[PDB]
Amino acid sequence: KDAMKENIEAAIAISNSVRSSLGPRGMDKMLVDSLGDIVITNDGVTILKEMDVEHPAAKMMVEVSKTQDSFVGDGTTTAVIIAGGLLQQAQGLINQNVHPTVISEGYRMASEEAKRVIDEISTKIGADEKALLLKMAQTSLNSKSASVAKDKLAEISYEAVKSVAELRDGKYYVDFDNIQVVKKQGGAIDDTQLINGIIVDKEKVHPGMPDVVKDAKIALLDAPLEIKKPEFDTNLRIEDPSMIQKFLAQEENMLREMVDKIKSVGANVVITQKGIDDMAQHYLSRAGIYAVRRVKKSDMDKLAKATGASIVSTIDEISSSDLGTAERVEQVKVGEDYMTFVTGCKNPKAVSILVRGETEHVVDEMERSITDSLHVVASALEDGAYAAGGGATAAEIAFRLRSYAQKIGGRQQLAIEKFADAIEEIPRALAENAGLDPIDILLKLRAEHAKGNKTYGINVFTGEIEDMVKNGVIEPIRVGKQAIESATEAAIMILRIDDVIA
């Protein structure tokens, strides 16, 4: 009765704090934390992970609705919007004494039928690959503040994914450890570029190291370049003043040797996750080796893949088989900062995107936006099919559930019709957001789909129901399946709970 009334309202509240961010006329959110950190975004996954939800129902709505399985396009915002719809509609049905178990069965079924409608009405990507994917990446950027440069960023998203995509069983596989995305402020959004190689935001460890090394043999380490102290308690016992010299000599010699090993195997560059002793820095420098230290592990993993190096933890046991390869490693100044560009890698399916923005908070959102585009085109390439956006595919599913409901008659049917009304939350949000009339757009939308117009959607620019694929507003088939998947699980979880206790 009440535990439910409350849980449901807490949940719907989350649904509405995200609703206005859906689509081409969607707005962003500014989220300020207790520590004062600020995040301004349109990304529904960031908004949710950010907002401080207290109510346990809200925490669950957030967790389950997260579309966790993948964060492609606006799957999470769409999931959340539908969960709120499904929940709000369940409220009504419960007011009529429909047992929450019927409702959960109905939702479960309608959910299954809906995934089916999508597979059915979907469309395989054909000889149109390049044009389709571009249109997809633009649709995505269209929702973001990155729209401003959607055509250039879309090209970058396409080029990058296409470069790292493996066409295996006649199928495509895209490994993101081949795409390095780095952000640097102090440039316009247009200055964003695709570099064929791996950029690492770090500079040479010592001023005397070279700024460029052609045909680099890269040593990737995971251990620090320092003296090793025994594990058992150890003490030097000096009784002869003369040994004091011999001892310090032995230490410096240990470091000099470590460098000799790395260099003896042909290493040209040394990139470590850990530290490099000041004296070791001297030696590498003197040997003319370009070294960078305290590198990000994620950066290490990407360098290994592109250069074909193996990350070594036992310098002593290092060998040439372990060395990576690249046509050139060079320090370049990107704005204020100095970065290291490893170009012409052994593995050519290795790329980087240098995201620019004038301001910190601008460049942050640009990277968020570009990482979205990459996942959109990559999942479309992988799935092989696409569905029309603009609320077209949702209006269709809604249309096709109202039929199926009458086939699966009974009380289940009420839950199934309610599930259809909920899916219509998408076209409503889109209309509401663009400044159109929901109740008006909805009626026309239903008409077109009844008359078999599968791809008909909401053109928020003209404010007219048109062909979404013709106009290019299309999305990966995956976004819709997951969103309806996450949405129904989130709603069923709250629907089954009749009490909250500590």
């Binding site: 006329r25 707005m27 500014m30 600020i38 959004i189 030097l236 004038e358 301001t359 959102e365």
Partner: protein, 503 residues
């Protein structure tokens, strides 16, 4: 948390407030702001980036505008105040459109159309010239509303002189690393006392009295490590059982310092600049041998000196060969003000110079240095680009006139946004009028006419009391700073305009 209208009107209000905080620093007649903290204390500047970086902004939306102080491409000279003031105006002008019913996104689209056009118009109208005379006009303009006295022409000349000294040509293009120009200051009064040195000036005295006051034909050793007694990494304890050993141990130390100095002498070095400390016994023997040594030298200086003298920074003295030594005709210590500084001159590499600023008050030498640094940047940029723009709000006035027309060639909603962007640009010429104390409304009226009659170079003239030709008065703005000030403003205004809820 705030939603919709309340969230937006509020954000706009915030942006406007922070713009007001820097507004009056714009131009030749700019005022200063006194920023006071708790411990360090008072800062007096006209520099907008400094003011904002220091300001204690509370509001999130205001913390966002303040971020422009960090966009290295904008935060030079009046670039910062221009970007902030413009964001404020872009957000203010937007509020009207939001009121009429225009969607924040079409407003954002209008601004994007407008700024892209403007960026085109200015490259079109940009004036070319690598003429040292124009460089001087860039500096004079950059030093305009600062508390530098009347010495500006003297300073401007130093700038061009320094810039042209380190400027180099790569494949057909001139690149100027400002990091090769060492600027430092010393409280001695005068300002006209600022010197241009062909070498690296180091705020460090020689470690020992008995060391030469001047070294000619210097073979300079740059050293990374401390010339002190080093203990092993693995713990070491000395055990003496023979009373006689105590002396020997005490002597091994002396001999250790003696050898350090022997190694140095063996390389032919006669000057030693150490980044770290030097033990007193080492200082003893260095002075004994006639080597001039300085200690605890900043890494920044270590690096500039390696650059200028060709010396390799060495850590292990055993790798101190004549190959790693730098060269300079003279290394001399000389008293500047109340301090004694070391002057490394006639370096192997000529592309390194220093500017020792003087000026007394302390709180003036700081802004003057703050000034000279911006001036150096602007002159350096222009040296590279070879292009500039007319100052005094001349550029904005042209842009405002053109975009007002370009708006007509655009669709309804966007057109509104573009007319709003055109109005926003007038906030610059108006701010200069207000600051100079002249009538804003009439200066704009006049300015518009003249630029429409084709007088591209007519900006706001304090003298003529109204508008006037900047071409004659020589007020010029670098290009790069302009385009980025417009771009920053637009990117940030859009970020803020898009928020409908702050949680």
């Amino acid at each position: 948390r705030e939603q919709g209208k309340n969230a937006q009107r509020n954000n706009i209000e915030a942006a406007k407030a922070i713009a007001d905080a820097v507004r009056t620093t714009l131009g030749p007649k700019g005022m200063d702001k006194m920023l006071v903290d708790s411990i360090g204390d008072i800062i007096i500047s006209n520099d907008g980036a400094t003011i904002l970086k220091e300001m204690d902004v509370e509001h999130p939306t205001a913390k966002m505008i303040v971020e422009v102080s960090k966009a290295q491409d904008t935060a030079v000279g009046d670039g910062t105040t221009t970007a902030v003031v413009l964001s404020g105006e872009l957000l203010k002008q937007a509020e009207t459109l939001l009121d009429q019913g225009v969607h924040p996104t079409v407003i954002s689209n209008g601004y994007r159309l407008a700024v892209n056009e403007a960026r085109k118009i200015i490259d079109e109208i940009a004036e070319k010239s690598t003429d040292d005379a124009t460089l001087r006009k860039i500096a004079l303009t950059a030093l305009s509303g600062k508390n530098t006295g009347l010495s500006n022409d003297f300073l401007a000349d130093l700038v061009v002189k320094a810039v042209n000294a380190v400027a180099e040509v790569r494949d057909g293009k001139t690149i100027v690393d400002t990091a090769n120009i060492k600027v430092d200051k010393k409280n001695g009064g005068s300002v006209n006392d600022t010197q241009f040195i062909s070498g690296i000036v180091i705020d460090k005295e020689k470690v020992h009295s008995k060391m030469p006051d001047v070294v000619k034909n210097a073979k300079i050793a740059l050293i990374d490590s401390a010339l002190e007694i080093k203990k092993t990494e693995i713990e070491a304890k000395v055990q003496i059982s023979d009373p006689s050993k105590i002396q020997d141990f005490l002597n091994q130390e002396t001999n250790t310092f003696k050898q350090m100095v022997e190694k140095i002498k063996k390389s032919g070095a006669n000057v030693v600049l150490c980044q770290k400390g030097i033990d007193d016994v080492a200082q003893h023997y260095l002075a004994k041998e006639g080597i001039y040594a300085v200690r605890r030298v900043k890494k920044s200086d270590m690096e500039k000196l390696a650059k200028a003298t060709g010396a390799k920074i060495v850590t292990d003295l055993d790798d101190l060969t004549p190959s790693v030594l730098g060269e300079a005709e003279t290394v001399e210590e000389r008293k500047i003000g109340d301090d004694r500084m070391t002057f490394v001159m006639g370096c192997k590499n000529p592309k390194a110079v220093s500017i020792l600023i003087r000026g007394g008050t302390d709180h003036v030498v700081s802004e003057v240095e703050r000034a000279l640094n911006d001036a150096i940047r602007v002159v350096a940029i222009t040296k590279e680009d070879g292009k500039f723009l007319w100052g005094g709000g001349a550029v904005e006035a042209e842009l405002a006139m053109r975009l007002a027309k370009y708006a007509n060639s655009v669709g309804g909603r966007e057109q509104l946004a573009i007319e709003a962007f055109a109005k926003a640009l007038e906030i610059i010429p108006r701010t200069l009028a207000e600051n100079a104390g002249i009538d804003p409304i009439n200066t704009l009226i006049k300015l518009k006419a003249d630029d429409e009659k084709g007088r591209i170079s007519v900006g706001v003239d304090l003298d003529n009391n109204g508008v006037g030709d900047m071409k004659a008065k020589g007020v010029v703005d670098p290009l790069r700073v302009k385009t980025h000030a417009l771009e920053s403003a637009v990117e940030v205004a859009t970020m803020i305009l898009r928020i409908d809820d702050v949680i």
